[PDB]
CSV table of C-alpha atoms and ligand atoms in Angstrom, one decimal:
chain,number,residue,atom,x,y,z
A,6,UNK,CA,-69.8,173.4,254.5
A,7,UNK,CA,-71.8,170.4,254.0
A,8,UNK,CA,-72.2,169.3,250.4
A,9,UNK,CA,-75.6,168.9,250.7
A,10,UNK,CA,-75.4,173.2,250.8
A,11,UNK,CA,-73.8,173.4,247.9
A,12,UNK,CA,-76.1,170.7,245.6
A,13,UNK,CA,-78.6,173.4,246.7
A,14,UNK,CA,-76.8,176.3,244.8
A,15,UNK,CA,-77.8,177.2,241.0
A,16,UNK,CA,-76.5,179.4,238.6
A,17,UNK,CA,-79.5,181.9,238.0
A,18,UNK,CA,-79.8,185.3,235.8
A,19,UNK,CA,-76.9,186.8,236.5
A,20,UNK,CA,-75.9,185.4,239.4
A,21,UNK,CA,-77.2,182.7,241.7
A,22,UNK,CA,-80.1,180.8,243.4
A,23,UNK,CA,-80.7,178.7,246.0
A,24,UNK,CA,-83.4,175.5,247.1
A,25,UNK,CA,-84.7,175.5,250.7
A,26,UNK,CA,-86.4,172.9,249.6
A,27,UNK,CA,-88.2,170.5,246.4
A,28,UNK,CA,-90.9,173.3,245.9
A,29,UNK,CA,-88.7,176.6,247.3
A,30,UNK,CA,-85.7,178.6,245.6
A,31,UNK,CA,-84.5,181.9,246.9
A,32,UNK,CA,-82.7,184.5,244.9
A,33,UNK,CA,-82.0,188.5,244.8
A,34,UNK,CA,-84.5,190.4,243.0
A,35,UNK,CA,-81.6,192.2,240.6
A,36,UNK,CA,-80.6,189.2,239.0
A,37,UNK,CA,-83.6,187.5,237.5
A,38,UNK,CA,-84.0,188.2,234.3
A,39,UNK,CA,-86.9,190.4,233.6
A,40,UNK,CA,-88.2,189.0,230.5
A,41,UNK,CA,-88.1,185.5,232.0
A,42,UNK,CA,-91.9,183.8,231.5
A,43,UNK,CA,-90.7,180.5,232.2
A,44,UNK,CA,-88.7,178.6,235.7
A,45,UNK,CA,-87.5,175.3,235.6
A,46,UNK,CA,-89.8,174.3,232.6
A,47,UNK,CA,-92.7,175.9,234.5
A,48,UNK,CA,-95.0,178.9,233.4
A,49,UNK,CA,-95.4,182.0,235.6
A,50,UNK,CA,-99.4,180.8,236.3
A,51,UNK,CA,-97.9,178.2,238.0
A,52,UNK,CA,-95.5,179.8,240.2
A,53,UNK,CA,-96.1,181.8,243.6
A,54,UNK,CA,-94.2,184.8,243.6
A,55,UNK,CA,-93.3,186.6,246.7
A,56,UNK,CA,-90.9,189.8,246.3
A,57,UNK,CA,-89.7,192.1,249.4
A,58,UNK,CA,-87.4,194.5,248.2
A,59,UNK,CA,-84.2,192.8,247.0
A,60,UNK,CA,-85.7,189.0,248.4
A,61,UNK,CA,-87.4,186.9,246.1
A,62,UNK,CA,-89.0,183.8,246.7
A,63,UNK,CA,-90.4,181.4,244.0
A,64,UNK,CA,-92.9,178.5,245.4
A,65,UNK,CA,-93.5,175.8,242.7
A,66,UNK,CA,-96.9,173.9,242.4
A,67,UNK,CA,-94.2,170.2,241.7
A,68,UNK,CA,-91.4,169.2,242.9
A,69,UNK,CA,-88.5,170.5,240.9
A,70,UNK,CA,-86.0,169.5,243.5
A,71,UNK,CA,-86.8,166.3,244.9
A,72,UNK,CA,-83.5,165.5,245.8
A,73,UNK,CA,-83.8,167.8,248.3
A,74,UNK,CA,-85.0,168.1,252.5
A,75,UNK,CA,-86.8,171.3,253.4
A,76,UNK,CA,-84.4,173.1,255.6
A,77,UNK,CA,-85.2,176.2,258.0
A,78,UNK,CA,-85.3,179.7,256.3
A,79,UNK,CA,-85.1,182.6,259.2
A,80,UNK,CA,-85.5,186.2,258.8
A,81,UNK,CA,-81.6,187.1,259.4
A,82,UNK,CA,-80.0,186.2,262.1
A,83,UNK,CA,-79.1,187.2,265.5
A,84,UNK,CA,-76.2,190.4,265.9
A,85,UNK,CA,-72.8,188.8,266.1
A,86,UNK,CA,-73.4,185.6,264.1
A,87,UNK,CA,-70.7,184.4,262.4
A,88,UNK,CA,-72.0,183.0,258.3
A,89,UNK,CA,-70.8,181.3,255.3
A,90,UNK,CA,-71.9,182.6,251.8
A,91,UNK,CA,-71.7,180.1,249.7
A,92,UNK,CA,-69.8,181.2,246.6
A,93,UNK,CA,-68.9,179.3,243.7
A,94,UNK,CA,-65.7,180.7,241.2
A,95,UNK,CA,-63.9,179.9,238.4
A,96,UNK,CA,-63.6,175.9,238.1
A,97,UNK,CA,-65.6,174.0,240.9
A,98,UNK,CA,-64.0,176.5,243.1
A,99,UNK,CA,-66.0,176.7,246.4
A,100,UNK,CA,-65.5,179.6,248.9
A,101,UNK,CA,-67.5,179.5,251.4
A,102,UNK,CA,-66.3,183.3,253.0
A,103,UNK,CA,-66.9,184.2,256.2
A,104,UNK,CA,-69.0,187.3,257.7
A,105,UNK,CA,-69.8,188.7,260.9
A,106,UNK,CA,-73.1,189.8,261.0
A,107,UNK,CA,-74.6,193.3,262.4
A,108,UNK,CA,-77.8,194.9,262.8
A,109,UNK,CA,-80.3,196.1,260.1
A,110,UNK,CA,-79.7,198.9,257.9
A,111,UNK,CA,-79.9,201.4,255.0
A,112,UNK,CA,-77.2,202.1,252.6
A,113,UNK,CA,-76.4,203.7,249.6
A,114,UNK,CA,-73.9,201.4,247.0
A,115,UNK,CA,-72.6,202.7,243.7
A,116,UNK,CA,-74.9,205.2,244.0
A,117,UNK,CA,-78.3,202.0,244.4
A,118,UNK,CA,-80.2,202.5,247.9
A,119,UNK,CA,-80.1,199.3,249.5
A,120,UNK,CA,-81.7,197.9,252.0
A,121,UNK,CA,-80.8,193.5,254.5
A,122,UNK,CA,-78.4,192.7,257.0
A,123,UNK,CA,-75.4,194.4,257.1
A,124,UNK,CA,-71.9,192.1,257.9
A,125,UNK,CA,-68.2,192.5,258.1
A,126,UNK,CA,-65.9,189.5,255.9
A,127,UNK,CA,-63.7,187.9,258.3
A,128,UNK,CA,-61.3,186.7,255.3
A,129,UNK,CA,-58.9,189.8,255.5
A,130,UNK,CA,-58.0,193.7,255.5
A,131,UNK,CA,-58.8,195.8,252.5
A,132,UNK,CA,-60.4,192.6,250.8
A,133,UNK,CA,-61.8,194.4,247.6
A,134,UNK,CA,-61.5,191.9,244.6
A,135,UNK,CA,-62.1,188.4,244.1
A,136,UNK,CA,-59.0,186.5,246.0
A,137,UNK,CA,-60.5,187.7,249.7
A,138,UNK,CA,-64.1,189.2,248.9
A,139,UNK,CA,-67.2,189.4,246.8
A,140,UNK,CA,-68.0,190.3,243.0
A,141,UNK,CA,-70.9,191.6,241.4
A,142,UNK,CA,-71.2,187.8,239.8
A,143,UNK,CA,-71.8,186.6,243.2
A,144,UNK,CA,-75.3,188.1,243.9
A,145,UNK,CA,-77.6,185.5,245.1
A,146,UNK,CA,-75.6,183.2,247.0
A,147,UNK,CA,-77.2,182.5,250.5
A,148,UNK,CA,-75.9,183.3,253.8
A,149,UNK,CA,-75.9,180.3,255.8
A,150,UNK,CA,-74.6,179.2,259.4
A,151,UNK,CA,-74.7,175.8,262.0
A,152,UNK,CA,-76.9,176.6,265.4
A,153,UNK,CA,-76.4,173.1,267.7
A,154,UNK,CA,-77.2,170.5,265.2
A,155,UNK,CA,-78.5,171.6,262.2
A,156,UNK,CA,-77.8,174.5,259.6
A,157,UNK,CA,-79.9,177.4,258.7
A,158,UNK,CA,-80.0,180.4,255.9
A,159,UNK,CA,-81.0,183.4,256.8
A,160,UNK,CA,-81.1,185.5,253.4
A,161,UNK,CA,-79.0,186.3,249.9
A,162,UNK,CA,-75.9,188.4,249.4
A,163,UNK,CA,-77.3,191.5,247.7
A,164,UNK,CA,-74.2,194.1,247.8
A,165,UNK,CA,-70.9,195.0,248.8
A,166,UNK,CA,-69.4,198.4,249.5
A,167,UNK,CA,-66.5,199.5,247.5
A,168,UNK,CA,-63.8,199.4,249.6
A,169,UNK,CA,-65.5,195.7,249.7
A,170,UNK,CA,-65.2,195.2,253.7
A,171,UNK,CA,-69.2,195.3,254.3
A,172,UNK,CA,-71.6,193.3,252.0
A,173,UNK,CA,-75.3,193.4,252.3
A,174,UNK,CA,-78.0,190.2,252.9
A,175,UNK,CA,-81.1,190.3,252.0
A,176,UNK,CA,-84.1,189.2,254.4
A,177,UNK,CA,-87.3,187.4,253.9
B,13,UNK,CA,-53.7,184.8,237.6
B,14,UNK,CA,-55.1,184.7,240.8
B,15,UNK,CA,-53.1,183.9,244.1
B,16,UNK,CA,-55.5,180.7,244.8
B,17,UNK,CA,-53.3,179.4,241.8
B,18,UNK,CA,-50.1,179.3,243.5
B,19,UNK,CA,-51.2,177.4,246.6
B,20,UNK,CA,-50.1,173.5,245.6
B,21,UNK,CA,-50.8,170.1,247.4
B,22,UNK,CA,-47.5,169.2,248.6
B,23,UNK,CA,-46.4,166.1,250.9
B,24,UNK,CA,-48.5,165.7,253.9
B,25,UNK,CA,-49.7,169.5,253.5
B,26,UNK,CA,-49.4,172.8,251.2
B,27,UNK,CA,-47.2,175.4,249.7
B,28,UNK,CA,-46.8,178.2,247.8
B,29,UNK,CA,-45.3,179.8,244.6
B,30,UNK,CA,-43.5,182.6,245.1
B,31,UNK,CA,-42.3,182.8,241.5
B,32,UNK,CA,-41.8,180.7,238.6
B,33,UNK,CA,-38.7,179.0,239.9
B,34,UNK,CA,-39.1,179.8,243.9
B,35,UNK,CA,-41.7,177.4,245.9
B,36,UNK,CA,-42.0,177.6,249.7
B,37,UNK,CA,-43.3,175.3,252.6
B,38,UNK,CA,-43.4,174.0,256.2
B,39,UNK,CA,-40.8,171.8,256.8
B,40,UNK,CA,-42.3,168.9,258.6
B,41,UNK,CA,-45.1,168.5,255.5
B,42,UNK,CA,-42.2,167.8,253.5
B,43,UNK,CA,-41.3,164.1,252.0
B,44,UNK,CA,-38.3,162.3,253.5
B,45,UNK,CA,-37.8,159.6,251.1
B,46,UNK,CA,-37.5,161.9,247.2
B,47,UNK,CA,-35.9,162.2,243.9
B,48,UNK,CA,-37.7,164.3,242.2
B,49,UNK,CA,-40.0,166.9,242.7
B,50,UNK,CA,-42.4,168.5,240.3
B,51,UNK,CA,-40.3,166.7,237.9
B,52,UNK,CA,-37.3,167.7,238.6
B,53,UNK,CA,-34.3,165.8,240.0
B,54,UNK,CA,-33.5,166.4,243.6
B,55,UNK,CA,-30.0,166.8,242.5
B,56,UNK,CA,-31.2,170.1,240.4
B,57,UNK,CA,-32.8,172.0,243.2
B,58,UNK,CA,-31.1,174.5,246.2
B,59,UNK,CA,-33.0,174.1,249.6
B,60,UNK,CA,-32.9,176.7,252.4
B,61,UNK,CA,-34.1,175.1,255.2
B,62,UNK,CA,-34.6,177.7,258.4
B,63,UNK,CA,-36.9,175.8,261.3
B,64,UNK,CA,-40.3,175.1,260.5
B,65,UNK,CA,-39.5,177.5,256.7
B,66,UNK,CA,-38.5,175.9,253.5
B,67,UNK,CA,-37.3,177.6,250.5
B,68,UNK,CA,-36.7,175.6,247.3
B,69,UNK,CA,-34.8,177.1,244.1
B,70,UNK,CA,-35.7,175.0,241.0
B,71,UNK,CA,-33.1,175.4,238.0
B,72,UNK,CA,-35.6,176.0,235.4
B,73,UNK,CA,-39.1,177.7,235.4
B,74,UNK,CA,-41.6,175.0,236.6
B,75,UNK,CA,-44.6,178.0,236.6
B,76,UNK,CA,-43.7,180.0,234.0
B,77,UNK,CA,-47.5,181.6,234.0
B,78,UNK,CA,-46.6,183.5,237.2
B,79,UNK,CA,-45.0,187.0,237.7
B,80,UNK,CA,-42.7,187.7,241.0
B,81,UNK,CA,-44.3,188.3,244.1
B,82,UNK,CA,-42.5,190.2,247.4
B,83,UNK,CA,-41.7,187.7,250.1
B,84,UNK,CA,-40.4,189.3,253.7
B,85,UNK,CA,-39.8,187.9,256.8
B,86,UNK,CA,-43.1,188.5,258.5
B,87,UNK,CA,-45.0,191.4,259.0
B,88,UNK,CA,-44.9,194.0,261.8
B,89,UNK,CA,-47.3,193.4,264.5
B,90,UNK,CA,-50.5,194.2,264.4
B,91,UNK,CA,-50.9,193.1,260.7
B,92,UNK,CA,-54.0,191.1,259.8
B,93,UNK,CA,-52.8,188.5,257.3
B,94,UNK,CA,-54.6,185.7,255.2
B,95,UNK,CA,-54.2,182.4,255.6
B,96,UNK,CA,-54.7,181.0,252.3
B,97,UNK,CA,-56.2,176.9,253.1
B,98,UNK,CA,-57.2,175.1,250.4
B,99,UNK,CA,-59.2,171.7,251.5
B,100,UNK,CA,-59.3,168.2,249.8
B,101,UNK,CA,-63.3,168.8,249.6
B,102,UNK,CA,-62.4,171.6,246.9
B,103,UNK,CA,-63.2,174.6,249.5
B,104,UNK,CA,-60.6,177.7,249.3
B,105,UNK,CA,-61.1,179.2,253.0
B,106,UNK,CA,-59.4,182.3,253.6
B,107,UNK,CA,-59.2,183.4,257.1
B,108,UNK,CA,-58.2,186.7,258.7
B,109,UNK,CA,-55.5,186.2,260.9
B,110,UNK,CA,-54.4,189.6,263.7
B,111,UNK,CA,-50.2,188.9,263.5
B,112,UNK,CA,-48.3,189.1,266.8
B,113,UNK,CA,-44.2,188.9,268.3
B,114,UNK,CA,-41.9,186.4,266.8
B,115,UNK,CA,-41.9,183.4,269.8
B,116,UNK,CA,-41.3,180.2,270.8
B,117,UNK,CA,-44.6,178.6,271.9
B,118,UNK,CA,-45.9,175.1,273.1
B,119,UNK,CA,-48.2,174.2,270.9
B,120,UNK,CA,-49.9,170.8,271.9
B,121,UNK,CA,-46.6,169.8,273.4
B,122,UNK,CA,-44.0,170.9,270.6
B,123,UNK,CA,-41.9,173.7,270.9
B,124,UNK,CA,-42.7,175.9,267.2
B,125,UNK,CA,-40.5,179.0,266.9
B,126,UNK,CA,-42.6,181.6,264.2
B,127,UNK,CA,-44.6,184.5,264.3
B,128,UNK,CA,-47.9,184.4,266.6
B,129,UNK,CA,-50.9,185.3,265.1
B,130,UNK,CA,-54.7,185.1,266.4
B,131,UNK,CA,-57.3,183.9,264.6
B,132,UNK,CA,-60.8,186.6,264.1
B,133,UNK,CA,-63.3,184.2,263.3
B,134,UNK,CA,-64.6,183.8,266.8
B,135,UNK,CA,-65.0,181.9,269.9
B,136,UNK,CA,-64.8,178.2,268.0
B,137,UNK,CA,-67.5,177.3,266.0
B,138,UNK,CA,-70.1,174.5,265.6
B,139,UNK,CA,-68.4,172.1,263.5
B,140,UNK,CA,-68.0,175.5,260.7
B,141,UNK,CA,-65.3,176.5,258.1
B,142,UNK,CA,-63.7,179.3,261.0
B,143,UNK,CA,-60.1,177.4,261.7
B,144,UNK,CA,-57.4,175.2,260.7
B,145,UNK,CA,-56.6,171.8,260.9
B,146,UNK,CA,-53.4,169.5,261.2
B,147,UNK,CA,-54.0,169.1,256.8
B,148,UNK,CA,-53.7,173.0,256.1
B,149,UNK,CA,-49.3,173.1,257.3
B,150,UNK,CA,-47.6,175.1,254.3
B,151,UNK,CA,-50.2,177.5,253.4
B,152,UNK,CA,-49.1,180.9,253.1
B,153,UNK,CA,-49.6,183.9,254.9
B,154,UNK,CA,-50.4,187.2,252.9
B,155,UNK,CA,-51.5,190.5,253.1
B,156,UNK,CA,-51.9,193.8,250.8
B,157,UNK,CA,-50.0,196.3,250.8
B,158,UNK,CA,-50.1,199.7,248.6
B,159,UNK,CA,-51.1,197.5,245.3
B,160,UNK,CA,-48.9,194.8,245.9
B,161,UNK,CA,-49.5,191.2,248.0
B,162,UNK,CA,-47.3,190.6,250.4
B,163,UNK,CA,-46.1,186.8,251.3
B,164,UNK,CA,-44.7,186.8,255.0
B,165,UNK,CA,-44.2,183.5,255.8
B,166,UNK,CA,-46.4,179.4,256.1
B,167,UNK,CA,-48.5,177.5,258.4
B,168,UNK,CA,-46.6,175.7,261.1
B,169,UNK,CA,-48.5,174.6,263.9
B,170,UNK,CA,-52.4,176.0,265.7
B,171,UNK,CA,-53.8,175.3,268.9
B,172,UNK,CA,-56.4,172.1,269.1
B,173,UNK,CA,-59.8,174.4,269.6
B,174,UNK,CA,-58.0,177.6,270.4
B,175,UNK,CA,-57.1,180.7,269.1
B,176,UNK,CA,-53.2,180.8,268.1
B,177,UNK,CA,-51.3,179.4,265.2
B,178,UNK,CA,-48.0,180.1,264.2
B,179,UNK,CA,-46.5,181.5,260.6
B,180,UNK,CA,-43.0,180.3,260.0
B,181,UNK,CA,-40.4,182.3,258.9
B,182,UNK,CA,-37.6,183.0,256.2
B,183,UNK,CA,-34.2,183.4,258.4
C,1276,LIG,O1,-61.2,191.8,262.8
C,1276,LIG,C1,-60.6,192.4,262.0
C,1276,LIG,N1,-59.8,193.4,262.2
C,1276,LIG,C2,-59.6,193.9,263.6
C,1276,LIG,C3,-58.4,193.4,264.2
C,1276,LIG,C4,-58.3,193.9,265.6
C,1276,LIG,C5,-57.5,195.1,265.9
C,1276,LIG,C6,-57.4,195.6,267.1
C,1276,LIG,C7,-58.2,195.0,268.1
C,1276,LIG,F1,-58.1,195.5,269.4
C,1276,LIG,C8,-58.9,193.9,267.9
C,1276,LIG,C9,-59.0,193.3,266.6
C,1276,LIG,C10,-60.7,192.0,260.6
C,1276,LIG,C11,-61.2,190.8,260.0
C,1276,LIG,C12,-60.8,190.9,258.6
C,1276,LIG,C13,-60.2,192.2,258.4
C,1276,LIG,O2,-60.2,192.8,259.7
């Protein structure tokens, strides 16, 4: 994946973040802290806040990312897509793991009712644990994929089952 | 402590710790001008060469951080293995893999003898981290199995924008 993806990734609560754009940064709603007051050396009165469920958007009044181009956000994506999440691991380790997507749904994870996208990895069978699928650490990385020219994200990885072959994206 | 650990830059490709003195490979990755490897003289270490599979036997323990894994001669079919790349860029990209027969195939004009396998990542791909490339020979095939993983055998050869590659082998 391009490493203009991964610049955009941040290490966030306890898990991850990621820029859209200078003024945008995506996460899951579980992982920011909940005493938190302060973003980036911003207060809250400065900050747009937009929550659905277990998507959170933050929208900053400067540029905190300048860096950065604004790239297309999209409400999932289409049944059958194929995404990256972009994971980071143990020692600028970078594992972008592949999904196939499916439709909408409601589940119930360690006992949590959750609510996104639903996928299948495509990295193995019986890929519970951290060689060949996800860990509760990685909550927050975004789920991203190429259509013709350009790249798109299309939400934050929010869950996995235990048995670890269906994880869970959460949508805008 | 993890199996990423194991998978080594090696020659023109990859390979794979099996243990702390066992190392395996695809044959044509290997150097043909050596006299050492990993520090050890060439004179010190057993090679078992089978096709498009190489075993080396160092005489003392080079990884002495790993335990012993099980390595088999492939896997029956129907098996969906990982094929554990790593890339220069610093990306680990496992990909499912559905194992086939054992065959010899034509494989942008060679003749590979290995076990067939089909990639399940899906029609191609725009230019996305879905498929292997000429750099990724000697990464290892695995698969879990009651508790333990399973090592059957390295990357030899794939189709250019197609679907099959080809595992190698022990005997
Ligand atoms: O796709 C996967 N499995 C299905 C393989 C298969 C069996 C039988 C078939 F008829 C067609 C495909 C997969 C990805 C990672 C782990 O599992």
């Amino acid at each position: 994946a391009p490493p203009t993806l991964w610049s955009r990734v941040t290490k966030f609560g306890s898990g991850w973040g990621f820029w859209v754009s200078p003024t945008v940064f995506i996460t899951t709603t579980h992982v920011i802290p909940t005493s938190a007051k302060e973003f980036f050396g911003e207060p809250l009165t400065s900050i747009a806040i937009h929550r659905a469920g277990e998507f959170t958007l933050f929208r900053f009044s400067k540029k905190i990312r300048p860096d950065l181009t604004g790239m297309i956000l999209e409400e999932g994506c289409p049944e059958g897509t194929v995404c990256s999440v972009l994971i980071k691991r143990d020692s600028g380790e970078l594992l972008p793991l592949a999904v196939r997507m499916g439709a909408i749904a409601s589940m119930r994870i360690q006992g949590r009712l959750v609510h996104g996208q639903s996928g299948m990895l495509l990295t193995g069978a019986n890929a519970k644990g951290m060689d060949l699928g996800t860990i509760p650490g990685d909550c927050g990385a975004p789920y991203v994929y190429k259509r013709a020219n350009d790249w798109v994200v299309c939400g934050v990885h929010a869950a996995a089952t235990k048995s670890g072959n269906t994880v869970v994206c959460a949508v805008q």
